[PDB]
Design a protein around this ligand. Structure first.
Ligand SMILES: Cc1cc2nc3c(=O)[nH]c(=O)nc-3n(C[C@H](O)[C@H](O)[C@H](O)COP(=O)(O)OP(=O)(O)OC[C@H]3O[C@@H](n4cnc5c(N)ncnc54)[C@H](O)[C@@H]3O)c2cc1C
Ligand SMILES: Cc1cc2nc3c(=O)[nH]c(=O)nc-3n(C[C@H](O)[C@H](O)[C@H](O)COP(=O)(O)OP(=O)(O)OC[C@H]3O[C@@H](n4cnc5c(N)ncnc54)[C@H](O)[C@@H]3O)c2cc1C
Lengths: 494, 499
């Protein structure tokens, strides 16, 4: 009964899609790509909004364009057909405080400058020196303020910590949940806003046999018969046999495997269960929750000075006073515990003014955990969403020379037509955005256990399974290429 | 006759004396060729009593700079102001285009940042695979990334990124690519009187130790147990240990012919190969300074850091687009003079915003430096040479063209126009006791070598100190300061532990 297959890939995200592509390109046939959703792409998904406008609600950028192999590949194509597949949209950040207004490039505040000194401080804090304890990003910032208070103005002490939190939008984590050791990292060059990551997804998906793709099939278990064979079971009853399998489900979905209860959507029952090294790696790495909100307006009636805008959370002069009077990190903690609801100003938010970079009168906004989890939970209540983001949307329009926003969801004033929201934390085949470090996490344990496979036949691919480009679309891509190559060679020696 | 002999009263030599004294060492003296202390640290006085550091000006790497932290503690204790954090957002000016900084369409700072990453990736974990000139490195980048750069970015980015010339005091075709990018361990603090630092240390040991105008010309280390030193005037001192702090450039004369060169010291026996071979790894740049003193501030204090970019050409762009490789671009870059204020980048510190003084402190680099210090006394010519960039700057700062008021001919209808009252220029390249600014790398150079050679010393008795004898803070005031405490400590114990 079990139909024979050379290789069976679980998940049609970019890792799985590139693993299949690699296999076909290497002359391997009789393979399959099992995907639980009714589409390919995984965390790469482009959606349609007001008037046919398109937005990437998952990944949006090609990072590290200096080294990024996926980007380079895409750039080569565009060098021939002259087609526009991406656009370099890095720009000078505009920072907005609710009270003070724009604080970027300010001749008195000089925030970007002290931020740079802070990064250096963090680097001098962990780089080189072995054995330093980890601690949260927030605690790292307080330590910086404490040690350098003699060289900072009251305004810098107040607004710097809030401006530094834009890093929260790189991890999808609040600074008190984020590992200080993982916060900073060098970007290998400018980023490139993909103009349809779906275009990248379809190009790869289409580079191999289409009857290889099986959508809407949710894998529920994988068994290794200690006799060169692997049994896979789709929920739709079908059973398969294969020499090899490449598992590319999110680290969060795979986690479900090391816990009791098998009736969880997306969970895969492994027999034998995943090795202890893999099991144990889950206690040393976690998952962040970066989310997106697409604010679509009728037309562009605001300044297009920049395509990057960050709204700072609220700060107070009281905080400055506490920093001035604290004797040590211990007292600052005590004094800081000063005693109410969560508003659009309770945390930083990162806005992408697509008007300037793509010409579309819309804003792409990034949010972090825990806000992401609350906002996605009420993803349906548009009225409530507008109320929540109304004050910061207004403050932006002010700073960008415009009037308060008008709710046109059902000539001189910005009219909001639609609001789109990500759903990654509530989606069972997602359960979050991507791998992230809580203080104490060592991503290396997971990368090592994943790339060494459960055994010779059961392998892993995905953004959480590799070092360079970890968490990125291109890293997931490379991992796909990594596992398919190892298998092509092995089979090649058949 | 003496226990320790310190040659040079720069900050390296003065710290070394301060230390020895701090460890109760007796009978030590400081021999300085000049008629003052401070070496490359010199604060001069100009119009209306304004003071300027014509040598070192900033405390670099304030996060780790131990000299700076010491000054900071002093300030915490007495409230006296010893420095100010003058880092600021740079204003970049092009003769034709005007301001090109923080531009919504040019975004030069962002690509310059990428430019920096690329440089790290090229020399990263490769053992520094064959260095080239900063200029060459920049061309590689332009070529390899042209597909992702606009025409104007290709034109102005190379010019803007040359601000790095003012950090080395070397033009981009003479500068080592591998050493072009530095750490910058935190903000910089402008010393509000480095003379305060020099004075403090000079006053921390026996005032009778110092001997000014004493040019040392020969250091003889007899296989016995004492060293012999003789100033040019004839006086000969002999001591247990000797800490030589003269600048690398001067020390590099000991390995040349003709002991008639001013400053050159004759070693007996000669400097071992290791040391002499160290000088083969280039070194010594020529950062220079010009101070423009105005009657009063009549320009906008938008920033305290202004950089005028050297002229560029669209013709250059066209060539980057065409070249098919590094060799074709290299040769396709053949344009067949005259040096003007626009032939190189110039760095202007607008002291009005940071220190409330109506002056500009301008930094220049080799080969321009030597030419400008050559005519330092020709005020009229100095004015004509920089007049165009000065006006270009004043225009951008919402002011008028400069008026020459250096002579006793003041006017009354010039209250809205900036009035230049005086110009002050350095003389480091032409001063025999400095012969340049400080250690620097020509492509192919390797500082580690001279550092180890100097650090190791000629022997347990003939030691070295100075901004070229250390790794952390190399070429900086604090590096020289530390190197001084270093040799001091060693010699200290070798004497304290004895009897
Ligand atoms: C909001 C957001 C923004 C992001 N922005 C960026 C960015 O700007 N740049 C960047 O580089 N990265 C970004 N990322 C990360 C990037 O999207 C991911 O690294 C990458 O898409 C992960 O790819 P993958 O192939 O490993 O996994 P997917 O996460 O691609 O997983 C593969 C597939 O497994 C399927 N699957 C799960 N369970 C089962 C099952 N039981 N049976 C069958 N199939 C199953 C899933 O449905 C999924 O399609 C972002 C992520 C999010 C969530
Ligand atoms: C234009 C300029 C700008 C600078 N800006 C900065 C800055 O912003 N920040 C910073 O950290 N550094 C700066 N520096 C560098 C800083 O000035 C030096 O690192 C430091 O002063 C070197 O100190 P030193 O003690 O090693 O040498 P000096 O160079 O201090 O040398 C010591 C002494 O040796 C004496 N000497 C030489 N030959 C003989 C001889 N034969 N006999 C007796 N005595 C002799 C000299 O006259 C001199 O006084 C700058 C330098 C220049 C030229």
């Amino acid at each position: 009964s079990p139909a024979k297959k050379k290789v069976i890939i679980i998940g049609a995200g970019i890792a799985g899609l590139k693993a299949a592509s690699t296999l076909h390109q290497n002359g391997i046939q009789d393979c399959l790509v099992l995907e639980a959703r009714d589409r390919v792409g995984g965390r790469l998904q482009t959606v349609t909004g007001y008037q046919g406008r398109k937005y990437d609600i998952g990944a949006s950028w090609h990072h590290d364009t200096l080294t990024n192999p996926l980007f380079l590949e895409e750039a080569q194509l565009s060098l021939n057909d002259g087609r526009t597949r991406f656009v370099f949209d890095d720009d000078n950040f505009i920072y907005i405080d609710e009270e003070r207004g724009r604080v970027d490039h300010d001749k008195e505040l000089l925030l970007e400058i002290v931020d740079n000194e802070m990064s250096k401080f963090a680097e001098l804090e962990f780089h080189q020196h072995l054995g330093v304890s980890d601690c949260s990003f927030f605690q790292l910032v307080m330590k910086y303020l404490l040690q350098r208070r003699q060289f900072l103005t009251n305004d810098q002490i107040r607004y710097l910590p809030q401006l530094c939190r834009y890093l929260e939008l790189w991890h999808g984590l609040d600074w008190k949940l984020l590992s200080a050791k993982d916060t900073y990292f060098g970007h290998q060059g400018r980023n490139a806003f993909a103009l349809n990551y779906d275009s990248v997804v379809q190009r790869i998906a289409q580079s191999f046999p289409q009857n290889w793709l099986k959508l809407s099939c949710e894998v529920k278990s994988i068994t290794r018969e200690p006799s060169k064979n692997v049994t896979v079971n789709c929920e739709d009853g079908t059973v398969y046999n294969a020499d090899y399998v490449i598992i590319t489900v999110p680290q969060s979905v795979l986690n479900l495997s090391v816990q009791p209860e098998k009736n969880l959507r997306g969970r895969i029952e492994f027999q034998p269960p995943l090795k202890p090294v893999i099991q144990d790696a889950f206690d040393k790495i976690h998952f962040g929750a970066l989310g997106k909100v697409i604010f679509e307006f009728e037309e562009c009636c605001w300044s297009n000075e920049s395509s990057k805008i960050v709204t700072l959370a609220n700060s107070t002069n009281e905080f400055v006073e506490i920093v001035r009077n604290a004797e040590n990190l211990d007292e600052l903690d005590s004094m800081l515990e000063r005693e109410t609801s969560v508003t659009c100003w309770s945390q930083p938010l990162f806005f992408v003014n697509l008007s300037k970079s793509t010409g579309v009168a819309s804003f792409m906004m990034l949010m972090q955990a825990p806000l992401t989890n609350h906002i996605e939970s009420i993803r349906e209540d548009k009225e409530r969403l507008f109320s929540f983001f109304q004050p910061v949307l207004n403050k932006i329009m002010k700073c960008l020379d415009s009037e308060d926003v008008i709710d046109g969801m059902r000539a001189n004033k910005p009219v909001l037509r639609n609001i789109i929201v990500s759903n990654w934390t509530r989606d069972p085949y997602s359960r979050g955005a991507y791998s992230a470090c809580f203080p104490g996490d060592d991503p290396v344990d997971m990368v090592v256990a994943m790339s060494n496979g459960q055994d010779s036949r059961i392998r892993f691919a995905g953004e959480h399974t590799i070092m360079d480009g970890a968490g990125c679309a291109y890293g997931a891509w490379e991992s796909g290429r990594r596992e398919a190559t190892r298998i092509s060679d092995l089979l090649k020696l058949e």
